[PDB]
């Protein structure tokens, strides 16, 4: 049959996808800006398709309910045929790979620690050995799941701490985690993807820091329904953009070129 | 039909694959040791296959001759059906991805600069602006091809330099490049994958250094013939090993645990 407009699912999160300040004046894909908006356009240009940016209905990345077996988030939108491609900071994981197709990574990263400047923490081991400085993750997504599923002693100890700590150490959004770091006088540290940590470190009021090595090493991938023909072309596009240096330029544009915390 | 032993192609290069010191006493897969030997065993264990380690006949990674259209190296062994899987420090590239299947990365890396300690170079830009300190790459493989194909001004200038420099700045093997750094009194710098640079930095006589940021960001993948059923299971195995922390442990074992240059 004839070509059809490709339905892209994504999620609103700076600096990946944001409504432009003047979005009310605009329409369609032009309402949005950010790293993933630019990446979507570069992929579509290379592959020769038209597309529509849509925002994932449930605000989630993708997990399977153990009782109902239903997939939520952007993964679910692909699994159930509601979108044709997901272009987002979506971590490549085994359980997701079993149900959807992923490109090779477009961005490499790991779980990391964000502190308020001056907090006496340098590593996950440091966090794990104490409770005065509380620490936690988002309440959904791959960072939380890393701790929940880990069999590594330090990370298992951290998960047991997080489930039992009071008040709750979990946050609903990145903005909430960052605000909690900023407002807690050194008594909250936030575990989050290194990408995001690096972005926030260059935002005013310039009071957060990434510390320590990353806890793991993984990647974000472009996702398509399992077996979709679009997958091959999108994957080749990711590889081409990487080989041309364009992914590095795009990260610099959205993270550093207009950083707010000096040179 | 019945299961058959899987033919693995790999290449002899420390610390990935080496003949054990006592190899003459041994037989079969047990003759070999190293990171990729251990990785092959972990993949086979997870997937439930028996396998035979073989060494790529032509000593190459994989490129296509522009005139004959023939693929060489480990890629060629897969393309032409001489091996079932390649388990090696084989870079995921667009042109290879078009002809073989790749797992998600098992190791992330980039092109990097190796200097003899004390050489006054900190970046690729520094190299590109001068000729007193000669610099080059292997004479085959993805590092050379990065420069040959680059449209980025600094790297294109470096390629033009490398093709025209005398005496030849290219080397046939990693060992030759390292020896040339070590013997050239600061007048040769070697461009090589960061993985390898990091390994050599922890080898006696402890006279080399990795300097500067990496020039690119890519990955090694396990490769199979295009469409081979083995690909899905191998890819899931890579993801599982990564998620369990085993790939990090394996790098530490072969790079750092017995490093020769201090703690
Ligand atoms: C906006 N980012 C920051 C962030 C994200 N995720 C989702 C994850 N990439 C997934 O795919 O589930 C996390 O799990 N931890 C984080 O710190 C998404
Ligand atoms: C043993 N390593 C070191 C090294 C290798 N390669 C081959 C490359 N991974 C490929 O797949 O062509 C390079 O191109 N540059 C290097 O410095 C393999
Ligand atoms: Cl349409
Ligand atoms: Cl917004
Ligand atoms: Cl057999
Ligand atoms: Cl050997
Ligand atoms: Li998949
Ligand atoms: Li491929």
Curated annotation (Swiss-Prot), chains A, B:
Positions where Phosphoserine occurs in the chain: 150, 184
Top-rank taxon, per record: Eukaryota
Glycosylation sites: 3
Protein name (Swiss-Prot/TrEMBL): Glutamate receptor 2
Phylogenetic lineage: Eukaryota, Metazoa, Chordata, Craniata, Vertebrata
Known outcome of mutating residue 94 to Y: Promotes dimerization. Strongly reduced desensitization
Binding partners and assembly: Homotetramer or heterotetramer of pore-forming glutamate receptor subunits. Tetramers may be formed by the dimerization of dimers. May interact with MPP4. Forms a ternary complex with GRIP1 and CSPG4. Interacts with ATAD1 in an ATP-dependent manner. ATAD1-catalyzed ATP hydrolysis disrupts binding to ATAD1 and to GRIP1 and leads to AMPAR complex disassembly. Interacts with GRIP2. Interacts with GRIP1. Interacts with NSF via its C-terminus. Interacts with CACNG2, PICK1 and GRIP2. Interacts with GRIA1 and SYNDIG1. Part of a complex containing GRIA2, NSF and NAPA and/or NAPB.
Gene name for this UniProt entry: Gria2
Residues given in the record as L-glutamate binding sites: 89, 91, 96, 142-143, 193
Natural source organism: Rattus norvegicus
Purpose of the protein: Ionotropic glutamate receptor that functions as a ligand-gated cation channel, gated by L-glutamate and glutamatergic agonists such as alpha-amino-3-hydroxy-5-methyl-4-isoxazolepropionic acid (AMPA), quisqualic acid, and kainic acid. L-glutamate acts as an excitatory neurotransmitter at many synapses in the central nervous system and plays an important role in fast excitatory synaptic transmission.
Site (Crucial to convey clamshell closure to channel opening) location in chain: 121
This protein's domain notes: The M4 transmembrane segment mediates tetramerization and is required for cell surface expression.
